Amino acid sequence: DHGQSDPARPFAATANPWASQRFSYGDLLYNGAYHLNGASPVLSPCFKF
Amino acid sequence: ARHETGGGVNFTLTQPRGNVDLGVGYTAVAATGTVRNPVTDMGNLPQNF
């Protein structure tokens, strides 16, 4: 959600508009459901996030 | 006493205890020395009238 504030940065909504929102290319590349990697064997560190 | 409600008897033992601030002087100064953590941060919250 992006009406509420970031916890870590309480004075801004999000510091990064592409990665934080749903469906938004920080989401689309690296979410566990969409799996553009997942047939690929290489470790994705952003799968932790 | 004893509860006739179920779950045991569970009633309260209580003791009363009185005291007087003893000594015409100052008698037990306390000293404040260290900081564990601020409960509120130095924050950015604006006043909203």
Yes or no: say if A19 and A27 are a contact pair by the CB < 8 Å rule. Answer: yes
CB contact B45 to A (< 8 Å) = yes
Residues 6+ apart with CB under 8 A from B7: none
Resolution in A: 4.1
Residue A11 with chain B: CB contacts under 8 Å: 44
Q: Which amino acid is at A7?
A: P
- Scanning every residue of chain B, which has its alpha carbon at the shortest distance from the alpha carbon of A5? B45
CB neighbour burial string for B2-35, b if at least 16 within 10 angstroms, e if fewer? eeeeeeeeeeeeeeeeeeeeeeeeeeeeeeeeee
Experimental method: cryo-EM
CA dist B38 → A33, B34, B45 (Å):
40, 12, 16
d(CA B29, CA B45) in angstroms, rounded, equals 36
**Interface membership of A10 toward B (CB under 8 Å):** yes
